[PDB]
Amino acid sequence: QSNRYADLSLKEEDLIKGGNHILVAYTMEPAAGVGYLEAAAHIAAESSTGTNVEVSTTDEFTKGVDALVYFIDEAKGIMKVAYPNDLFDRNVTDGRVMIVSFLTLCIGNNQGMGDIANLQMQDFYVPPRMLQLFDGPAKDISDLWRILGRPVKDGGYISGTIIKPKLGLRPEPFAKAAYQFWLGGDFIKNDEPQGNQVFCPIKKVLPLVYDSLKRAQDETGQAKLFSMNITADDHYEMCARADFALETFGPDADKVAFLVDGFVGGPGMVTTARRQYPSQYLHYHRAGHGMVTSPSSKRGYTAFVLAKMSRLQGASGIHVGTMGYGKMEGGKDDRIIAYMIERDSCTGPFYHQEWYGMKPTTPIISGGMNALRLPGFFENLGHGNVINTAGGGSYGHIDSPAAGAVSLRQAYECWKAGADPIEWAKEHKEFARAFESFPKDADKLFPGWREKLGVHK
Amino acid sequence: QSNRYADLSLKEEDLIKGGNHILVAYTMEPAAGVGYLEAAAHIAAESSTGTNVEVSTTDEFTKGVDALVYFIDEAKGIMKVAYPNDLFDRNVTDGRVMIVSFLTLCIGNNQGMGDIANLQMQDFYVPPRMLQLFDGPAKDISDLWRILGRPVKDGGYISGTIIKPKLGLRPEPFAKAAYQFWLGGDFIKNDEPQGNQVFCPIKKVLPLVYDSLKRAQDETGQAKLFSMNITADDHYEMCARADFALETFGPDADKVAFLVDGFVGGPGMVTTARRQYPSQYLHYHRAGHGMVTSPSSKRGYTAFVLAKMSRLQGASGIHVGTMGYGKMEGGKDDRIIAYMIERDSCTGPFYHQEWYGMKPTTPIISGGMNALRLPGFFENLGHGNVINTAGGGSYGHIDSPAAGAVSLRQAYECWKAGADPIEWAKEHKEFARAFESFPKDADKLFPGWREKLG
Amino acid sequence: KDISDLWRILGRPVKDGGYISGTIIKPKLGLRPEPFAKAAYQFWLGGDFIKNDEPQGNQVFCPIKKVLPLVYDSLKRAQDETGQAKLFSMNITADDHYEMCARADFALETFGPDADKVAFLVDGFVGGPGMVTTARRQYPSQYLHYHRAGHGMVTSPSSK
Ligand SMILES: O=C(O)[C@@](O)(COP(=O)(O)O)[C@H](O)[C@H](O)COP(=O)(O)O
Ligand SMILES: O=C(O)[C@@](O)(COP(=O)(O)O)[C@H](O)[C@H](O)COP(=O)(O)O
Ligand SMILES: [Mg+2]
Ligand SMILES: [Mg+2]
């Protein structure tokens, strides 16, 4: 099928300039005894206009929408395919494109082919017209900065946490833990699985959470933010939770973000939040993604691809990991993921992308961070225009959750001032106490801290 | 954490009899330098009530809902976890459980832990009360048999296809292609990506397809079935397509199945079809699943787990592959996947499951099949109470799509009669002509066929 | 839905699960919410199944919003004490389609994790096919209890 579904003489520069194709770059390894080009061509066919044999029903018009392999490097195990724009599904309702079609064609059936050892998407290019037909984000970090009374341009670090334990707190205990963090921090979110468990019903816990928000706001003089999980199988269940949340928070309802477990939940749930509640910050939680985005995986698509898709879907923010600075699987090069979702112009691993003013998706950092690890994280990224949720780093603090929230903020102020963390600790109590809260991390990152800070009987 | 999130003295037999836990069996390999139990215990914690450090907010009540490792085999790389039922989310609207919560906890964050090399679910057990709170299927194959005028019990083989090419046919060509197959076959479905492309809009093609269904019904005197793709990001787009489909088919609207790309589309799209249009057969298409279900994968979950979940979600039927008899990745032991979704009582790789009358999900066979390959597939499976869609096997036939449909039916009749395929071909032209349509398959499966068939 | 779904909830064989004990709340009209809830609790200590009498709904002396949460408390209390599941069949009969749905929605929300144990009773003969289909099509996952009040006006042995 090489003759029909491959044209290795096409120039990528031309395919991009034309603006008539979505381009996709994969890593690929063919099965034993299978030629590399024929594998790529079969993938292109199975991912667009054909199957594994000739069919009587094929006409010449069909060939015009064939996906085409325009580049392969067998030595490097790379293949690139051009997908004509007209292949992708459109809403009958409003003509917009849908991400589920992109997934179906470009990373659907080709993941189960017997003649393919493995196939993973590394990057993709979206031309101007296709980008115009995606929803894109309706809210972004600047809306949160505005609420917090900080500059809508470069408003900087937003301190946050997840309520701990991840499951098991009853309504009153849950509301109290929320209150305690907000005395020092900006941002609280449900842990990914917390919803309407029988031991902590939503109708009971949420009004109490709002009371905690009000009390913290009155006492601190600062606005507070809450990100609520509305993930659910039933579309109308999602809307029921959402409707109840906004009514409950009343005059502070703009401060309610909606969290959706978008990876295991799928594009449907993300779009429900985005289209039915565009005026609420949409928080994309990627739980489960590791099953394909892991460094050891040669299937599906990468974390980078996921983040870039989420921006098109209309996520206000998305988890991008800790880039090797915490407890999940990530490395320092993952900073490109944040750049791609927050900048108007950025170059991915294979494709440069212009966003033409589409709103930025906030990079949200979570997973094993604390005040001691943050200075190193910020140095790698180059800035702090982020939301940083730290469950362990906050509730794990020896003094209080509030002190934990403060320690996170002081760590950012330390890095921003370009100061020495140990010396910074000498003038910032909460930050200093984080060393004693997480001594194993302290010994590794800042050896000799006990001696320098006078932490001894 | 081992002391808290593992109790290897718990008896699995007791955990099952109690009916208070969902049990899950994984393959697991810890990261380098990490002990197996400490890995397992950490996995249990991250999948329920805790994190990687102690927190001041922990109370004693939280421990009662801790997930517990109750079994490990470091040598075989197996671990099993008991998840208390109360952990899982419930609708405020109607109290039922949701599959996305099961996914979030049992195969969510645990796929990205740095101290875990890999982790994949092999099987799970659902106790009676949790099962009562799942939607389950509302329609099944017996509903199709009833329409087709066949016994609602063991109605047997349903011949089918996918329209080929998978993308690109315009409305009139598309509808004409549909008509040609139905002259011989029962069942047509959209290929997984076909919807409202600009070269073939739904409002244009669907009325033409219905015309094709009517012409074939009048001419064959047999009822026909069509499975339409309604997959879409927007819930209300799905409903727009569904509403239009039912109105268009009018008095035959009961013969319309709704196809959903449930893996890439997610539980949200499946439940939209299941709950808003329960009286329509819901066809679960598993496009994308190979990224975790592949034999080469050590992450996510297996095809078996996926299929078992789909039944809980309320799929009327789901793709289960060709079990090593076609072009995708599958083997003969995959027949257990079909058994688990269609039987009332079956034993999985790790757990026996009673279904207590929940409707069976139809095993749908698709992917590189033709009349020559079917006899081997049926012998392995043991029956033909299946829907078999063959795109290439049908439109690939040298004579016609109708002839292709007949050859598929004749292949089932051959196996059912326990006949020799080469000798069966001597009395069935359509079946015989399938040898010439796919000579390469013919040479492998039936060497010397050219001489015997002349 | 059918009786096998009820057998399943009750933990009995889904095939030939046998006798389901039940009752109607007495007096047929007149109990206030607390008295009504108490009567429900008392039967459920021994029985499986309770249903509204055919006319009981939202009378001014016993509003639905008041009584239904109390009935659910009684169902829970009986379940906890007997270790047996209990069933309740609620009248949602009403002229207005949207009144029926309001009652149905409120009932399922109220019963929360036990909402599958709520049946919907419809006075189908005097109420007509419209009301029956409303329950059947808008709430198919809830057991539909057809009450034939009024039927005797034509079905009587004396009727021709
Ligand atoms: O459940 C958890 O583990 C977290 O709350 C982190 O808690 P801690 O702050 O206590 O570690 C986050 O949901 C994960 O980090 C998500 O991972 P990611 O952002 O990589 O997708
Ligand atoms: O798109 C296709 O390739 C098919 O129409 C097969 O066409 P052919 O009959 O022409 O091969 C099916 O969708 C796949 O088999 C799905 O795979 P699975 O059932 O394994 O999920
Ligand atoms: Mg979490
Ligand atoms: Mg297909």
Ligand SMILES: [Mg+2]
């Ligand atoms: Mg009565």
